[PDB]
Design a protein around this ligand. Structure first.
Ligand code: HEM
Ligand code: HEM
Ligand SMILES: N=C(Nc1cccc(CCNCc2cccc(NC(=N)c3ccco3)c2)c1)c1ccco1
Ligand SMILES: N=C(Nc1cccc(CCNCc2cccc(NC(=N)c3ccco3)c2)c1)c1ccco1
Ligand SMILES: C[C@H](O)[C@H](O)[C@H]1CNc2nc(N)[nH]c(=O)c2N1
Ligand SMILES: C[C@H](O)[C@H](O)[C@H]1CNc2nc(N)[nH]c(=O)c2N1
Ligand SMILES: [Zn+2]
Lengths: 411, 411
């Protein structure tokens, strides 16, 4: 009931009581552990007040006014509005708290040392897909900041009935397009080949190349979604070169500065924000390892090993490992030479251990998903490999949600 | 009740019913997942017959004589001997089945495609620490096989009362010594600094260098353990050189061929074999990444990066990643040039996916611990990163047990 986690590199031991405040379930039982399953899985008015009271009780327990008059009146005020409308509305202050703590509680996020430096843009007055486009452009501009990236989230009107949801249909606001070929192979990004076809099915004229920024598909208050093209001056991009290999320029790769994830669901005191694009910056390995070297992604280990002139006959020459290190040296180098914010897996994983120490001390714990925290290269030479982590679900939280082209009633 | 696991690189989906036959617990609950905790945690006669019947029922269900006359007589025969002695004895055939399936069920082992090619040495007639030494030498010789390594296990008398346990006190039969210095730093292997002091406390004269093979500490039928030195001709060793960097010889590193783990507990039909050293061969990363580059181990990223002439000022130059790839190219290269069996993390992790497919088909599943299956470098460029794995505990099994110098009543 007061579990211990250990670091098997420093022998540092931390004690977790926060997990007791945990609410939702994990997927594991006493007889099976599902910690490596990828995907871990209308709200009546009855259910809504406990969640509202729970959230409000921790919000006032955080500004050091827990149970005071201002708390009990806001507790009754929300009670009365849930009676009235069977739902309710968050103060601007409650929206910033919730949003910031959804991130704080994201157990798969290695960058949470930043969780309280987050810029919350309230788009709950938005009503049209054009207004969404506007808010999203102002998000991209603000968060990019000439390469000095700043974390931000734009929060669109909460779900109400279920048939009038605001959704961004892009998985990320900025994403490269994918096109299959006559021979079957894939130009651009193979991850987005279906979404790219949806945008074309809706009128996008594709500039069928590799690094084509996709248009925004925006669904407002349940209406069929509409295409908008981000002004290209707002899409900052980093051409990838190596500090040694001048043919690495000839490789002709480039990535975008701003990772801005738009397909998730933000849960605050029982309320559901189905459109809530959030952005920070990249850990280097997301691009260098996964985007560039996942077999089903850009898959450049073949080509980089060729230009490096490597023993590509034997699996056991570690030519794959060799070309992967250089690819991530280049991504880091390129981003830093252009003054565009990026973080390497060593700096990022060190900061998380330091972040973990702060959470166990001033909060009683820190939910963490080892399968996701440990970087996808060089696992054990980073300090998170050697750190035991307790995973549990706290709220406010970010959740997965189905893609809207399977849910939506079309016209 | 019939769960699905997916590979997010091939979209291959396998269905697991084996987990229903699971017995022991995992440490996870519906509200916390402990899949990254390192350590996952006398037997009365009442408890012993269910475990005996369970094991025997699956042993006869495996030779296609489930419930026949030979089964029911052996079921009654063991029933009667557990009445008699409150314990019982395994046939030689039952010992090989159990031992082989303990390995088959080891969810953290990536090499289990070999589980049925295992040589079982029955040392249940052993009575003295000298006889243990003898059996263990014959194990090392047989399993080494002039570098053409062969998997084997030597099984010493089962626990009975608890105060008369057979134990090997070495963590592995072959291990390098560790000595701390006046200034505090550590010669040899820092992992074994305490055990090395125990052997010296018992009379070992240390040849205080790096790669000093430790003597065997053997405890027989509960008696105080006794030192024996493996004949050096039986300890095969691989000097580590690089196929490019001739100063890598001057680094002067070497490892032993045979990984033979001696500190675990083999559980078969409720019986407990506290001494059961088992051996196979190395995946390359155990040595190249963990043994050589764990901060608390040999820790040679400093020195290899120096000789490579690297940017060692910035964390973000990936000089650590760079020196780690070369170190594992050398370990592989050295082992293969000497005809000593080793496997690279790519070949080994591919075989496990192929092994997984066989288990889900002819067995209904395959318990697997992702945190341990994914190699400690280059995670996602190997196919196990992208493979969902269900972890659950089946029996027969290998278990951890406390170090005997904390348990034992000394004289
Ligand atoms: C400050 C810079 C940030 C960095 C360096 C960072 C880094 C990462 C990385 C590498 C992942 C793993 C995801 C993957 O590999 O696909 C992740 C997950 C995640 N992050 Fe952070 N992140 C940052 C900011 C944020 C912000 C601002 C939020 C929310 C407001 C957030 C919420 C999440 C969530 C919800 C997930 C994982 C959910 C999932 O896909 O299961 N992150 N982060
Ligand atoms: C055939 C060659 C084998 C290879 C290549 C191999 C590979 C591995 C590796 C890399 C690990 C991870 C352990 C670590 O990183 O510390 C492991 C775990 C394990 N293997 Fe295998 N292994 C082999 C044979 C065997 C045999 C013959 C047995 C038993 C008879 C066995 C039982 C286990 C157990 C019990 C564990 C992990 C238990 C733990 O420490 O939690 N293995 N194996
Ligand atoms: N579909 C596949 N995998 C997959 C499936 C479902 C989900 C996922 C994981 C996709 N989360 C993307 C994501 C979420 C959060 C943060 C970041 N990053 C950041 N820095 C960032 C953005 C904003 C602030 O910070 C990236 C992956 C697949 C097929 C083959 C290989 O993979
Ligand atoms: N004490 C630490 N970690 C730690 C603690 C407890 C347990 C462990 C894990 C130690 N299993 C060793 C092991 C078990 C089984 C197989 C192999 N290998 C083989 N190929 C092999 C041998 C026979 C057949 O196959 C290696 C590690 C520590 C401190 C700092 C960094 O780590
Ligand atoms: C099957 C497995 O759960 C899947 O590959 C996970 C593993 N860990 C991950 N970790 C991160 N950060 N991102 C990922 O996409 C994944 N994928
Ligand atoms: C804290 C964490 O559980 C620990 O580092 C584990 C992670 N996975 C591992 N995987 C293997 N194969 N060997 C290990 O020693 C470990 N250590
Ligand atoms: Zn679990």
């Amino acid at each position: 009931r007061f579990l211990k986690v250990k670091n098997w590199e420093t022998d540092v031991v931390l004690t977790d009581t926060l997990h007791l405040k945990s609410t939702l379930e994990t997927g594991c039982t006493e007889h099976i552990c599902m910690g490596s399953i990828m995907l871990p899985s209308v709200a009546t008015k009855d259910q809504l007040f406990p969640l509202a009271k729970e959230f409000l009780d921790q919000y006032y327990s955080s500004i050091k006014r827990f149970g005071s008059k201002a708390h009990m009146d806001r507790l009754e005020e929300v009670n009365k509005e849930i009676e009235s409308t069977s739902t309710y509305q968050l103060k601007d202050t409650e929206l910033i708290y919730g949003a910031k703590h959804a991130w704080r509680n994201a157990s798969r996020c290695v960058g949470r040392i930043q969780w309280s430096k987050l810029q919350v843009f309230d788009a709950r007055d938005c009503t049209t897909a054009h207004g969404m486009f506007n808010y999203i452009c102002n998000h991209v501009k603000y968060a990019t900041n000439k390469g000095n990236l700043r974390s931000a989230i734009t929060i669109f009107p909460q779900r109400t009935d279920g048939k009038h949801d605001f959704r961004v249909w892009n998985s990320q606001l900025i994403r490269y397009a994918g096109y299959k070929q006559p021979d079957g192979s894939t130009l651009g990004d193979p991850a987005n080949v279906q979404f790219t076809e949806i945008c074309i099915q809706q009128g996008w004229k594709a500039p069928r190349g590799r690094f084509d920024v996709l248009p925004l598909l925006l669904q407002a208050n349940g209406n069929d979604p509409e295409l908008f093209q981000i002004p290209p001056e707002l899409v900052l991009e980093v051409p990838i070169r190596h500090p040694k290999f001048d043919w690495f320029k000839d490789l002709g790769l480039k990535w975008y500065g701003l990772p801005a994830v738009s397909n998730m669901l933000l849960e605050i005191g029982g309320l559901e924000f189905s459109a809530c694009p959030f952005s920070g910056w990249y850990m280097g390995t997301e691009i260098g390892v996964r985007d560039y070297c996942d077999n089903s992604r850009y898959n450049i280990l073949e080509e980089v090993a060729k230009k490096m002139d490597l023993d590509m006959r034997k699996t056991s020459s570690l030519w794959k490992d060799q070309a992967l290190v250089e690819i991530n040296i280049a991504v880091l180098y390129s981003f830093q030479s252009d003054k565009v914010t990026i973080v390497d897996h060593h700096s990022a994983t060190e900061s998380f251990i330091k972040h973990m120490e702060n959470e166990y001390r001033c909060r009683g714990g820190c939910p963490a998903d080892w399968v996701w925290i440990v970087p996808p290269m060089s696992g054990s030479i980073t300090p998170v490999f050697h750190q035991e982590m307790l995973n549990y679900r706290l709220t406010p939280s970010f959740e997965y949600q189905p893609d809207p082209w399977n849910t939506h009633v079309w016209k």
